[PDB]
Write a protein that binds this ligand. Structure first.
Ligand SMILES: *C(=O)c1ccc(N(C)C)cc1
Ligand SMILES: *C(=O)c1ccc(N(C)C)cc1
Lengths: 306, 306
């Protein structure tokens, strides 16, 4: 029993974290095989930052412009190239700690673990959901550029996020491991701001199913709803529309609990309209949207507490 | 910016997790140097469980009663002994992945990271607070016996918790690494239940200081309070008494923010009496008590956003 924001064990990623310095700017990089990945930010100074031309900044660098340190060992850079908003630095040594891995671009509403790092040294680990508005509610200080997000599937580390910057409201933005930003954001100092966010309906529903698997039915009701009537309520409360694809994704959780998706939708509609009446669901006073259907299957028993 | 329940990176602990089997019972153990630690539960079957005499159960075992597996490698047991509620199994091989480490008994209100494990294989990591009533709000399924809790200080892994069992309300109980239970609990199937809990006043206060360091003052007021008058309100709302020792612990956070402890106490008293008026503090709709003063200093900037 229990239900917690649970990160993946971070060890396979810790063995990949290095420090990268160019001039006076230091940040974190990711060492896989004979390549180190890091934000292209590393070639900027504070004065470069309002209007940097990375192409023009980069051509002025040599391999030995870059200092890469894995603990006490210096890794010699023997090639560099820019790919979107990241640099790929080729180094003389292949990381013996490289795990089996993949690069994936995650979709909004999906979750991943973040290994917050400073000066190449891992410091903390927590789970994030990719918001609909392409930001994450992270916890990052100066020096955290190049901290990575990942999921782990069996042997294999799926890398999905490299951290870049903090937006005016204190949420965080970054890129996949091809260096393409999540969202409309750019690695420049501008007035850019996160767009209006929305609640991730499919996750809230997954989390209601979690509650039932764990033994709680207080919020269910005798009603059902159509997809359409549900979505009218969703629009009023700033929840994403429910789609048939999402209903289909909820199939296994519905089958384990014996509650039809559209019946759970009715329960949610009631919760939105009437509130929770001073009660909790899985320890929470609010409706939680930071767990995917997969996160629920991962963490909950396969046997419902009936 | 940001503020999250942040676990320590779990890698130094993952390299210590093994599987231990005796008869048909399997669970997790902790391999440090040439010793494996695990719950003494491993020598019980379901029928042993209502009234087990561990002394009597253990004397019937030999070293080769115990199967210890670190991945694909069998570790041969060459000695065993019982210490309170754990077994210490001496093995033929010293763990080459042993980190620098210490065993510590944590105090109620303190926090630690939990590496949830199954069959010797780490599966997730999250932060827990030791409740005043000596339980943790974990997330554990069958097979999680022997999952460990730890903090990391510089080089050094401070082990503080080995998981044993789940109580009737779904919260969790276990021991330090000397095998002594946190709380009045016993490793038997009885009607035992967690005692009445209380809110950890010192942590709530630390978390209010976190909010100010991160730039938010909405909940402050023009009032002060005496320790006594505060504690009368605390008693009404089931919060721990504030003590001068705790006020002293808050010294650094008070100095960084320029808010006197007893002035922050007044703000808390107002929040308790009047509620939060539909607002949030660090993203939360409720007063959070699962972060210590140390956790706040660890995660927040040393510079207040004034
Ligand atoms: C670190 O990688 C990084 C990247 C971008 C920015 N800004 C665009 C301000 C800051 C730090
Ligand atoms: C696993 O270590 C463990 C320990 C104790 C119990 N009970 C006392 C039921 C169960 C599992």
């Amino acid at each position: 029993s229990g239900f917690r924001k649970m990160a993946f064990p971070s060890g396979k990623v810790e063995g990949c974290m290095v420090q990268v310095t160019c001039g006076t700017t230091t940040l974190n990089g990711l060492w896989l095989d004979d390549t180190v990945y890091c934000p292209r930010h590393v070639i900027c100074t504070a004065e470069d930052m309002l209007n940097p031309n990375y192409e023009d900044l980069l051509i002025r660098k040599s391999n030995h412009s870059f200092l890469v340190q894995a603990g006490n060992v210096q890794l010699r850079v023997i090639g560099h190239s820019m790919q979107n908003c990241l640099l790929r630095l080729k180094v003389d040594t292949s990381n013996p700690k490289t795990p089996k891995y993949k690069f994936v671009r995650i979709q909004p509403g999906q979750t991943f673990s973040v290994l917050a790092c400073y000066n190449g040294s891992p410091s903390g680990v927590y789970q994030c959901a990719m918001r609909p508005n392409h930001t994450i509610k992270g916890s990052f200080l100066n020096g955290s550029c190049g901290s990575v997000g990942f999921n782990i599937d069996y042997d294999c580390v799926s890398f999905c996020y490299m951290h870049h910057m903090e937006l005016p409201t204190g949420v965080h933005a970054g890129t996949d491991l091809e260096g393409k930003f999540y969202g409309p954001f750019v690695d420049r100092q501008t007035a850019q701001a996160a767009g209006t966010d929305t609640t991730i309906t499919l996750n809230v529903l997954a989390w209601l199913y979690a509650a039932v698997i764990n033994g709680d039915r207080w919020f269910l009701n005798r009603f059902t709803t159509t997809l359409n009537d549900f979505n009218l309520v969703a629009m009023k409360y700033n929840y994403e529309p429910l789609t048939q694809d999402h209903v289909d994704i909820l199939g296994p959780l519905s089958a384990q609990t014996g509650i039809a998706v559209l019946d759970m939708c009715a329960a949610l509609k009631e919760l939105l309209q009437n509130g929770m009446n001073g009660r909790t669901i899985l320890g929470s006073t609010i409706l939680e949207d930071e767990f995917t259907p997969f996160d629920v299957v991962r963490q909950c028993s396969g046997v419902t507490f009936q």
